[PDB]
């Protein structure tokens, strides 16, 4: 298990923090979630939390 | 995960036996007092009606299930009842009961489970 950053693809800078298991799902996770900057659901992509 | 009980003034009840299906509509004022039945229709009444005009096989048949739904619709319409809540129990999953419920919804009566 690891902590990852889900970053908006709208380039607004908004992000979410979630937990993922890299071995069970060895691919970039993507989800639809609300973006307060824009005001609607958009597509988010996994990124390194650092 | 049982849900909390919700009080409703009008409820629909079904009693499925070996031989017939009974439907009742009862009005309540409070959970602590008895209700008043406003509609009482069973497949026994439908069988006596249809058999005279159109031969049917037995009371527990598709023809009688639709007939019971039609008779229930007329009584509720006459008394100005358009929305009812269904009481869910073991008998509610009977095939005969489910056919009656489907017919009622198509006729125009709004039946709600929750």
């Amino acid at each position: 298990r690891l902590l990852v950053k889900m970053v908006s693809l709208a380039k607004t800078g908004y992000f979410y923090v979630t937990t993922k298991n890299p071995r069970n799902t060895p691919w970039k996770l993507k989800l639809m979630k609300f973006d307060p900057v824009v005001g609607r659901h958009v597509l988010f992509e996994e990124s390194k939390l650092k | 995960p049982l849900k909390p009980l919700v009080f409703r003034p009008l409820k629909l009840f079904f009693w499925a036996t070996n031989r017939h299906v009974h439907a009742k509509v009862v009005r309540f004022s409070s959970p602590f007092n008895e209700g008043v039945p406003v509609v009482d229709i069973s497949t026994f009444d439908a069988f006596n009606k249809l058999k005279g005009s159109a031969p049917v096989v037995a009371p527990r048949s598709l023809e009688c299930y639709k007939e019971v739904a039609k008779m229930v619709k007329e009584e509720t319409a006459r008394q100005n009842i358009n929305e009812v809540t269904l009481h869910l129990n073991s008998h509610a999953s009977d095939r005969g009961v489910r056919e009656v419920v489907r017919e009622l919804k198509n006729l125009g009566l709004l039946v709600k489970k929750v």
Binding site: - | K3, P4, L5, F7, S29, S30, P31
Partner: protein, 142 residues
């Protein structure tokens, strides 16, 4: 060598005929020994709370499979189950706050009074600060 876990107070909080107001906890339990009845709710940890103004009731039911079920009910003030009782409950809630403030006294303050105003977000009051503090309405356009 020793040690003990922090105690959890399982058990009922009210008996038959006791008056409750919305949001009050009636039962704390680890498992669903008691089920929610009328005018009540249940939390994700089986905590039962009241949702209207009324009195607590207890009842037992025998199920189809021979098991025993126990319910918790809240009964309206005058056995009024009509849909108009909701507005009466809303007024009673406002009144109850006024009674408490009168009994407590003026020196038990119930609202803050700072030398500054709290920011507004999405039409409500927010406890989070803005990057810069400014006086309201002391600036003109351009």
């Amino acid at each position: 060598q020793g040690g003990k876990s922090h105690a959890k107070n399982w058990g009922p909080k009210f008996g038959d005929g006791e008056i409750v107001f919305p949001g009050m906890i009636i039962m704390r339990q680890k498992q669903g020994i008691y089920s929610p009845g009328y005018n009540v709710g249940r939390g994700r940890d089986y905590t039962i709370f009241a949702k209207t103004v009324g009195y607590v009731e207890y009842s037992k039911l025998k199920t189809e499979r021979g098991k025993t079920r126990r319910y918790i009910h809240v009964v309206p003030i005058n056995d009024d189950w009509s849909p108009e009782y909701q507005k009466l409950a809303d007024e009673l809630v406002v009144r109850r706050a006024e009674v408490k403030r009168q009994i407590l006294g003026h020196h038990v303050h119930t609202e803050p009074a700072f030398h500054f105003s709290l920011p507004q977000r999405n039409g409500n009051m927010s406890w989070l600060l803005n990057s810069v503090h400014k006086f309201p309405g002391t600036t003109t356009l351009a």
